[PDB]
């Protein structure tokens, strides 16, 4: 029979499913929910059926396993959350029951049936009674992921914690809940032998910050949702009272209080007006209470007496180019080259469905010890750059005419806001943010551009102060990161000039049996949890060693989380609460995505190397590596640099990655992956399912066994192996259907003047010049048509082909 074991000795390190009261155990449950594979998941089916969470016919439904399509699978998991809470309450009635006896030992998952009683008292050592200690680090570390996937807390929150009892009328005016948090902790996590702080202001280093934010989220998934949000008081200026915010209450960092608050002031300068207009308090107080029955989120919506309904216009079809193309004998019957990319119109109910897509987002607890070791590894991956705070004279800001957010957009874009304030005002605002929280509201619009599918795309515009401070920090850090060549993350490198060739050669490096692989993350921005976003921000702040103390960095992390992670959105003419998931407004969200991707990859490798049984590993050096991996994960609380360097070198030798935000290319040694000692794709599927709450279907992850044909697809470009003057080089060529679509449909900015039309046409031809060297003639005819059309445009008012050839020569 097959069963999941968590064993550790001198011989064998790692949680492994091999062959050796309920039928199944807690370790089996965590494994089945943490190592999911829809091909062979009969154990999960049996677990769900055996205890009346739902019926086998529900599994007989198509896509019973998914989280996105048919999002009603959480209903059951919540019943298993009730079971989890029952079995987690017996972990404190046994520890304090054996501690008195005076017994030193470790508690493992695999000694506890699904009810909660225990067995197999074989490993512990006897000591004087009243002086015992159990080791329960690995237990809770591995049990964490299913304590918000199943929650248990909606079951807990009853008048005496009985499910047959009404809901508690909590006080509506009480906000802190610190004593209740500590009581929950001392009931559920009494023996966790590290200090937990109910507020995260009282923690010691960023690793403690992560640990306490994880526990704060788990404890804050049980409180009245009308409580988290800005805390306001009544302030007076020149006699007239205000209602402004003097704190905030996260789910992640508990209650935080401003330290520079001015009661009984007399006047407000520019910075005070900026912050007080950015406050949601004046807007949520001056407005009507709203109950929008369309969506399932909370909603306090005012500022107008009627909702606004916005629609998306259809495209503008161009007749001249299409007539030319049909005269060139294209789109004839039985062809592979046709039009498939269009402009789709939308209603506004599309905006409400987009907000429901924001609803596709859960509270997650992630594992903590593997998170801290993945964060050490990722810091090693980023150990080749330089960071720090800069003054207002060291930001370079580009493209100054983006949206300046709400309600700042009523009088201009960010250009006016940046040419209004002097540098000193921005530095003073920054220094104020170093001790204060400024909760903020974001405008949401609909996006108007090409797609292949009927769905609506949206975009978010964030306020000016949050972008200003993210600008200082990550202008320095990203200008350091992006001005490099040859690293793991490839951002800001032109694919031209042999750049793609050099990138691919660095991906090859010296890997033994190179096979290529890729992925994409289903619903990236909507499902990316809070823990990993905080971890990415914490890495980017860990690049601050010399400029900030603990307090400044914690206040900056709190500002980032309150402005980007869980702020309130102005959607139409309403104010809703945005539960989580990234905003699309800064570049440090593409870099948070990059960090997230690297995290995912490292976690996948860790699982693949530790969930493989070393007794079938024929090498012994990787066996010792796995043993030390388990040691550094579930043992030492301190950080060990030597083994981190060793594992980073191991990855760089056997797992070469080429990373852009959400879009990756992996070159890996094939025999290792066949043995599993580098990341396969089922490991990525399982990791995404259990830690990001989407299911990555197998039809969008590809595998290429010959390298002499390159990446199948990366960054929306295809590659072919061509010969160019006694050199075999890799060239990127697009999908030409997209090129034809962009040529026939334009969106009325270029329908006035021709210069920008020729600009668009030359850019399209440049992106699709290399199509000449593909074997098929039709693509070269596409390039010839584009050249002829640009020639005709130039005549009726870059026209020779060579200008585009030199675009792709590495000179």
């Amino acid at each position: 029979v097959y069963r999941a074991f968590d064993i550790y000795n001198d011989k064998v390190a790692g949680f492994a499913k091999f062959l050796k009261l309920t039928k199944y155990t807690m370790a089996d449950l965590v494994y089945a929910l943490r190592h999911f594979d829809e091909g062979n998941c009969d154990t999960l089916k049996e677990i769900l059926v055996t205890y009346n969470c739902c019926d086998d016919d529900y599994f007989n439904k198509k896509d019973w396993y998914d989280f996105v399509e048919n999002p009603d699978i959480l209903r059951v998991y919540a019943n298993l959350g009730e079971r989890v809470r029952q079995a987690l309450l017996k972990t404190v009635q046994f520890c304090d029951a054996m501690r008195n006896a005076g017994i030193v030992g470790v508690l493992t998952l695999d000694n506890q049936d699904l009810n909660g009683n225990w067995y197999d008292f074989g490993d512990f050592i006897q000591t004087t009674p009243g002086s015992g200690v159990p080791v329960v680090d690995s237990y809770y570390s591995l049990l964490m992921p299913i304590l918000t996937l199943t929650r248990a807390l909606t079951a807990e929150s009853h008048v005496d914690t009985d499910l047959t009892k009404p809901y508690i009328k909590w006080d509506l005016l009480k906000y802190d809940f610190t004593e209740e948090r500590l009581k929950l902790f001392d009931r559920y996590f009494k023996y966790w032998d590290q200090t937990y702080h109910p507020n995260c202001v009282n923690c010691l280093d960023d690793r403690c910050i992560l640990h306490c934010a994880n526990f704060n989220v788990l404890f804050s998934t049980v409180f009245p949702p009308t409580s988290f949000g800005p805390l306001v008081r009544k302030i007076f200026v020149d006699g007239v009272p205000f209602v402004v915010s003097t704190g905030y209450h996260f789910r992640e960092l508990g209650v935080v209080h401003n330290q520079d608050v001015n009661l009984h002031s007399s006047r407000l300068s520019f910075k005070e007006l900026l912050v007080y207009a950015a406050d949601p308090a004046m807007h949520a107080a001056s407005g009507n209470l709203l109950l929008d029955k369309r969506t399932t989120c909370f909603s306090v919506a005012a500022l107008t007496n009627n909702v606004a309904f916005q629609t998306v216009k259809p495209g503008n079809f161009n007749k001249d180019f299409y007539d030319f193309a049909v005269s060139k004998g294209f789109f004839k019957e039985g062809s592979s080259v046709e039009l498939k990319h269009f402009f789709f119109a939308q209603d506004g109910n599309a905006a409400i469905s987009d907000y429901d897509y924001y609803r596709y987002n859960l509270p997650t607890m992630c594992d903590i010890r593997q998170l801290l070791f993945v964060v050490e590894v990722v810091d090693k991956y980023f150990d080749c750059y330089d960071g720090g705070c800069i003054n207002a004279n060291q930001v370079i800001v580009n493209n100054l005419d983006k949206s300046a957010g709400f309600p700042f957009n009523k009088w201009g874009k960010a250009r006016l806001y940046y040419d209004s304030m002097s540098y000193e005002d921005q530095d003073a605002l920054f220094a104020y943010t170093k001790r204060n929280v400024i909760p903020t509201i974001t405008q949401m619009n609909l996006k108007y551009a090409i797609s292949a599918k009927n769905r609506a795309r949206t975009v978010a515009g964030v306020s000016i102060c949050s972008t200003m401070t993210n600008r200082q920090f990550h202008q320095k850090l990203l200008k350091s990161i992006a001005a490099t060549r040859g690293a793991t993350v490839v951002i800001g490198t032109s694919k031209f000039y042999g750049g793609w060739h050099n990138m691919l050669k660095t991906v090859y490096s010296d890997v033994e049996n190179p096979h290529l692989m890729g992925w994409d993350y289903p619903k990236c921005d909507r499902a990316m949890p809070n823990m990993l976003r905080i971890m990415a921000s914490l890495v980017l702040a860990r690049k601050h060693t010399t400029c900030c103390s603990l307090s400044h960095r914690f206040y900056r992390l709190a500002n980032e989380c309150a402005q980007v992670l869980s702020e309130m959105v102005m959607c139409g003419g309403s104010l809703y609460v945005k539960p989580g998931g990234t905003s699309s407004g800064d570049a440090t969200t593409a870099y948070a995505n990059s960090v997230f991707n690297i995290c995912q990859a490292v976690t996948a490798n860790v699982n693949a190397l530790l969930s493989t049984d070393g007794n079938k590993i024929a090498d012994k050096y990787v066996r010792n590596l796995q043993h030390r991996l388990y040691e550094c994960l579930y043992r030492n609380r301190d950080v060990d640099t030597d083994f981190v360097n060793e594992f980073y070198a191991y990855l760089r030798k056997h797992f070469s990655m080429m990373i852009l935000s959400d879009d990756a290319v992996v070159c890996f040694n094939s025999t290792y992956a066949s043995q599993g000692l580098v990341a396969s794709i089922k490991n990525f599927k399982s990791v995404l399912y259990y830690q990001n709450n989407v299911f990555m279907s197998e039809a969008k992850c590809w595998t290429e066994t010959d390298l002499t044909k390159g990446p199948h697809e990366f960054c929306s470009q295809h590659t072919m192996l061509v010969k160019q003057g006694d050199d075999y080089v890799y060239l990127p060529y697009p999908d030409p259907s997209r090129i034809l679509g962009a040529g026939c449909f334009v969106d009325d900015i270029v329908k006035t003047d021709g210069t920008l039309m020729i600009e668009r046409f030359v850019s399209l031809a440049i992106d699709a010049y290399p199509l000449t060297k593909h074997p098929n003639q039709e693509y070269a005819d596409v390039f010839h048509l584009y050249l002829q059309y640009i020639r005709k445009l130039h005549d009726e008012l870059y026209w020779e082909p060579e200008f585009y050839e030199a675009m792709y020569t590495p000179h």
Binding site: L172, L231, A284, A301, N306
Partner: protein
């Protein structure tokens, strides 16, 4: 004088939010707290005197606001000025189980706070 422009703009915005702001019930809800420090999600919930409900279809008009006066936030609300999705005024005497497909959805139910 563009800096002063947006300065005066925000200042007049603040003053017009202030003229719509000061009551005594908000002062009593503040003075019933421990130290006056109060969340934000409960200021309009228990202070503002007008509720707006947007109703997508007929089954939720039937399950939410069937009648003249309805119940939300443990209080009673008195209806007025029912408006369709096109800002044309709809009489309450139309919204029925058979006539619903003939009228544009959703609908805007604007209520005033009944003591």
């Amino acid at each position: 004088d563009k800096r002063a422009k947006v300065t005066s703009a925000m200042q007049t915005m603040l003053f017009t939010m202030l003229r719509k702001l000061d009551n005594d019930a908000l002062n009593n809800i503040i003075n019933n707290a421990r130290d006056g420090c109060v969340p934000l999600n409960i200021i309009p919930l228990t202070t503002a005197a007008k509720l707006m409900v947007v109703i997508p279809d007929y089954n939720t008009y039937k399950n939410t606001c069937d009648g003249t006066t309805f119940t939300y936030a443990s209080a009673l609300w008195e209806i007025q000025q029912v408006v369709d999705a096109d800002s044309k005024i709809v009489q309450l005497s139309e919204i029925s189980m058979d006539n619903s497909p003939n009228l544009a959805w959703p609908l805007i139910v604007t209520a005033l706070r009944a003591n």
